[PDB]
Amino acid sequence: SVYDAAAQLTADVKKDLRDSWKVIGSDKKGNGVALMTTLFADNQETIGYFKRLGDVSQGMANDKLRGHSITLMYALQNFIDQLDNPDDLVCVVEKFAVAHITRKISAAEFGKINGPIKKVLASKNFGDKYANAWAKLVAVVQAAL
Amino acid sequence: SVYDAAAQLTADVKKDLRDSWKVGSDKKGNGVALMTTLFADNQETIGYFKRLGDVSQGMANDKLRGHSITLMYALQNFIDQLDNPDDLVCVVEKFAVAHITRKISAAEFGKINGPIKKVLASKNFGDKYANAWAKLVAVVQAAL
Ligand code: HEM
Ligand code: HEM
Structure with a gap:
């Protein structure tokens, strides 16, 4: 239940x-x-889903990948801004869940983003504590897939 | 090109x-x-949003609410990329594709200018501001 998952976002987690x-x-x-380059490096089997972006190995030089990556960050911004209201958090999460369901992305594969998030956080000196907090937010989206 | 439309956004417009x-x-x-105004003044567009269900439900419609909030973050994205045309262009093309796939022409996309003008007016931002926003919308139209 996406609603029970959202309830897991306690004061400390938020x-x-x-x-x-x-x-x-x-x-x-x-x-x-x-985040994206780490995902493709650690989980090569997911690259096939991103056909449209072209040669993702080009990283920042790839215009489509850059546009996709920036936009993805605004989806996370969206989630953070909705933390005060679970009803709004849920409806935006379901909007993005649909975008991935149509792409045939399961909850299990969506969860493969946890590795990249942990690594990106660790590079900014944010440990497991924070990685786990983000895993709970990702869990809300997973509940809708 | 889209780059030309983006590069011609002046300091005063930004x-x-x-x-x-x-x-x-x-x-x-x-x-x-914004969405309810689009549906009120351009009823012919309602059909394109069938995934959202009954859009006459407004705020109560969770799908419409989710769509509307997300649309505002697309605009947030654009605004944040104003000083770097290269980044603005790549995000604009990303969203252009989303509308190209739905068969939304440049002319149809321009129908949003009316609703934007009205929303701006509700906060007392006049024609000068509506004109500025029409220029930003024109950058997207250059990609459609
Ligand atoms: C932090 C988690 C993630 C977030 C917030 C997220 C967000 C997004 C957003 C905003 C889009 C664009 C939606 C659209 O325009 O249709 C997108 C597209 C996509 N996402 Fe994710 N995503 C995440 C993780 C993943 C993972 C782990 C996979 C795959 C294993 C995945 C696969 C896809 C695919 C295939 C697309 C389509 C790209 C294209 O063809 O343009 N996403 N995602
Ligand atoms: C300021 C102008 C506009 C912005 C920034 C904008 C933004 C968006 C965004 C972010 C999405 C979701 C993309 C996705 O996840 O695939 C979307 C979907 C869509 N847009 Fe727009 N849009 C604008 C104007 C319009 C106009 C004027 C029309 C039609 C006359 C239109 C028709 C559509 C349709 C049909 C969808 C798909 C809705 C669905 O089935 O979920 N858009 N738009």
Whole structure:
């Protein structure tokens, strides 16, 4: 249940999400492409889903990948801004869930983003504590897939 | 090209876009207002949004609300990329594709200018501001 998952976002979890987002969300282009390139490097089997972006190995040089990455960061911004209201958080999460369901992305494969997030966070000196906080937010989307 | 349309956004236009967007402060409210106004003045567009269900339900419609909030973040995206044409262009093309796939022409996309003008007016931002936003919408139209 996406609603029970949303209930898992307690005061402490929300604070950690906001605190870490202040840092990694300051450079959407840089960290966005970082997340994607890490995903493709650690989970090569997912590259096939991104046909439209072309040669993703080009990283920042790929205009389509850069546009995709920046936009992805605004989806996370959206989630963070909706933390105060689970009813709004849920309806935006379901909007993005549909975007992935049509792409044939399961909850299991969507969860493959946890590795990249943990690595990107770790590079900014944010440990497991924060990685786990983000895993709970990702869990809300997974509940809708 | 899209780059030409983006590169021709002047300092004064960007200033008006940012100042008016500052007042982007209520994405849920203004996002839904934008959509409901589009449906009220251009009833012929309702058919394109069948995935959202009964859009006459307004704020109560969770799908419409989710769509509206997300639409405002697309605009947030554009506004944040104003000073770097290369980045603005790649995000604009990303969203252009989303509309090209739905068969939305450049002319049809321009129908949003009416609703934007009205929403701006509700906050007392006049024609100068509506004109500035029409120029930003024109950047997207250059990709359609
Ligand atoms: C933090 C988690 C993630 C977020 C917030 C997210 C967000 C997004 C957004 C905003 C889009 C664009 C929606 C559209 O325009 O249709 C997108 C597209 C996509 N996402 Fe994700 N995503 C995430 C993780 C993943 C993962 C892990 C996979 C795959 C294993 C995945 C696969 C896709 C695919 C295939 C597309 C389509 C790209 C294209 O063809 O343009 N996403 N995602
Ligand atoms: C300021 C102008 C506009 C912006 C920024 C905008 C933004 C968006 C965004 C972010 C989406 C979701 C993309 C996706 O996830 O695939 C969307 C969907 C859509 N847009 Fe727009 N749009 C604008 C104007 C229009 C206009 C004027 C029309 C039609 C006359 C239109 C028709 C559509 C349709 C049919 C969808 C698909 C809705 C669905 O089935 O979920 N858009 N738009």
